[PDB]
Amino acid sequence: MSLQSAQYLRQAEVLKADMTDSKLGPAEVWTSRQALQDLYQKMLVTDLEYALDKKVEQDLWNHAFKNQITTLQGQAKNRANPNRSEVQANLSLFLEAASGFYTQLLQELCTQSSSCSYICQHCLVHLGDIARYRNQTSQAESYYRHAAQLVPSNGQPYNQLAILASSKGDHLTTIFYYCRSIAVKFPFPAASTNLQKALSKALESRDEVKTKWGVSDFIKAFIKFHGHVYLSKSLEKLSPLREKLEEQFKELLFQKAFNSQQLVHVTVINLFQLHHLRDFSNETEQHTYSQDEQLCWTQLLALFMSFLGILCKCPLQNSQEESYNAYPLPAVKVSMDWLRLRPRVFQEAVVDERQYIWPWLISLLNSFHPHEEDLSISATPLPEEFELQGFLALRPSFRNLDFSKGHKEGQQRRIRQQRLISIGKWIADNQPRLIQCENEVGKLLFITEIPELILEDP
């Protein structure tokens, strides 16, 4: 009961300051670290509630592991180390042991509660940091993922996944995870300064000299665009960069240069900025925007609608029999899921301007031979849905799916199609001027009076 903890807690503080000790030896420090570790484990297992409040979880990691790991990484990471194989070896044993401690802790604690789901997430995370420390990139990732899946609303798992991504030079992935970490009910404070720091560095490179981009170039230019907006720096760049990004996105996407994953990251990063500039509040109350803020929303919203349109064409354009599509599909779906939540965006100048994209979506919906799909909520989450849990801008789109049981294609491609068929119905019922769905004989046919934009031949 709450009474044994007080004793366990006072006991703990007695061991904590011990680890600072100037008065305890080279190896009375460790006899103390082990004790702390044990004491903390008993509390977390004995009174998780009382434990979390006192923040045992965090003191357990910092004082019992992190401090040592950093000190060790230091002494072992060349300083003209007297013996630095010896230190590297201990760091190695220490991390090996740390991993063992948390694996054990996890199994004990997790073998409805939010506090339970929490600490289990907390364990997976550090178990992920240790893997990272032990250069076990795959397992570190797997751990951080699993951690995320437990409490989508927390942003630390995402921030850790970006650090891992950055260490491998995967920029798009990195920016994506910082965004995921920042956009949740409980954002990881460090994620904001991390993104800012990353975007500012990005804006340190000059405009691309090439007129024909490779996927790697696109990514770089794409991130600077977000850099410019996010930091609201040198906006004069936006307009041309937008047009060039649009041109290149089209060519690359059509050459199959992207994988559906990057398409999702690009879309989510675009959704991140959009929401970051004007949240759901803008769909309620009317805010005033600076001239520069308008320039950003105008350029950003535009790039997004252009991309969405380009994504809806990619499918019906000229491969692998059914696979000519479906790389773009998750990105189209995500894009549409957001529009469905922002009615007032359909009134936007840059959006009216592009109502030529709807014919492409429409011919894409009838590409599915729609029937009664407005059935309706498979409830079994698709990949891109599981992946984006907790993302503010998209949260409402999830308020029906059960992410618990869910565990492969036909069951996902044919579901995603329904999701799209569903959105077309919603558009048809909420923006009648854009799309209409003639529901006849249980067969659904999507149509639009908007003519198809057919550019010149080549």
From Swiss-Prot:
Q: Whereabouts are the TPR repeats?
A: 121-154, 156-188
Q: Tell me where the transmembrane regions lie.
A: none
Q: Where in the cell is it found?
A: Cytoplasm; Nucleus
The superkingdom of the source organism is: Eukaryota
Question: Positions modified as N-acetylserine?
Answer: S2
Disulfide bond entries:
none
Outline the subunit composition. Answer: Part of a complex that contains SMG5, SMG7, PPP2CA, a short isoform of UPF3A (isoform UPF3AS, but not isoform UPF3AL) and phosphorylated UPF1. Interacts with DHX34; the interaction is RNA-independent.
What the protein does? Plays a role in nonsense-mediated mRNA decay. Recruits UPF1 to cytoplasmic mRNA decay bodies. Together with SMG5 is thought to provide a link to the mRNA degradation machinery involving exonucleolytic pathways, and to serve as an adapter for UPF1 to protein phosphatase 2A (PP2A), thereby triggering UPF1 dephosphorylation.
The molecule here is called Nonsense-mediated mRNA decay factor SMG7
Full protein: residues contained: 1 to 497 of 1137
